[PDB]
Design a protein around this ligand. Structure first.
Ligand SMILES: COC(=O)c1ccncc1N
Ligand SMILES: COC(=O)c1ccncc1N
Ligand SMILES: [Zn+2]
Length: 139
């Protein structure tokens, strides 16, 4: 689990969104595994605006942060899980690293701020849903 809090937005994995997230829906993209809901409290996270390919992600199944190199956001074929059939996830970034389903929502960060959130994994790879392109998160 985990979310990003910026302005009056909460960014979560679409597959982990709650009933309140869907009741306060701002934007969702199934192909990206992202959902943004509205919040009453002001968020204070900074979204990275950059094309860094290095950063640090929180891994709840290790209680550790790991520095990684990751690919630029792209359309990557993702195997079926309990949440989606097999399909292309868009705006996905891969790194070599440990990931388990419950690690979804872990934040990937660079020097500029939040890059994205843990969304996918398998065979020693961790996939992160990019948020850096969502410029509207910042007004
Ligand atoms: C998104 O979680 C998964 O489906 C997953 C499966 C297997 N290994 C890592 C994972 N993250
Ligand atoms: C989980 O802690 C972090 O890595 C972090 C949180 C908030 N701002 C910057 C950070 N590096
Ligand atoms: Zn950056």
């Amino acid at each position: 689990s985990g979310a990003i809090y910026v302005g009056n937005y909460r960014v979560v994995n679409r597959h982990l969104a709650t009933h309140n997230d869907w009741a306060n829906l701002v934007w969702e993209d199934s192909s990206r595994d992202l959902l943004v809901s509205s919040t009453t409290a002001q968020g204070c996270d900074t979204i990275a605006r950059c094309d860094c390919q290095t950063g640090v992600y929180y891994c709840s199944s290790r209680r550790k942060h790991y520095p990684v190199s990751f690919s630029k956001p792209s359309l990557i074929f993702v195997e079926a899980s309990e949440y989606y059939p097999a399909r292309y996830q868009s705006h996905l970034m891969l790194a070599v690293g440990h990931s388990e389903p419950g690690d979804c929502g872990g934040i990937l960060r660079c020097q500029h701020g939040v890059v994205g959130i843990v969304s996918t994994g398998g065979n020693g790879l961790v996939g992160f849903a990019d948020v850096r392109d969502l410029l509207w998160l910042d007004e």
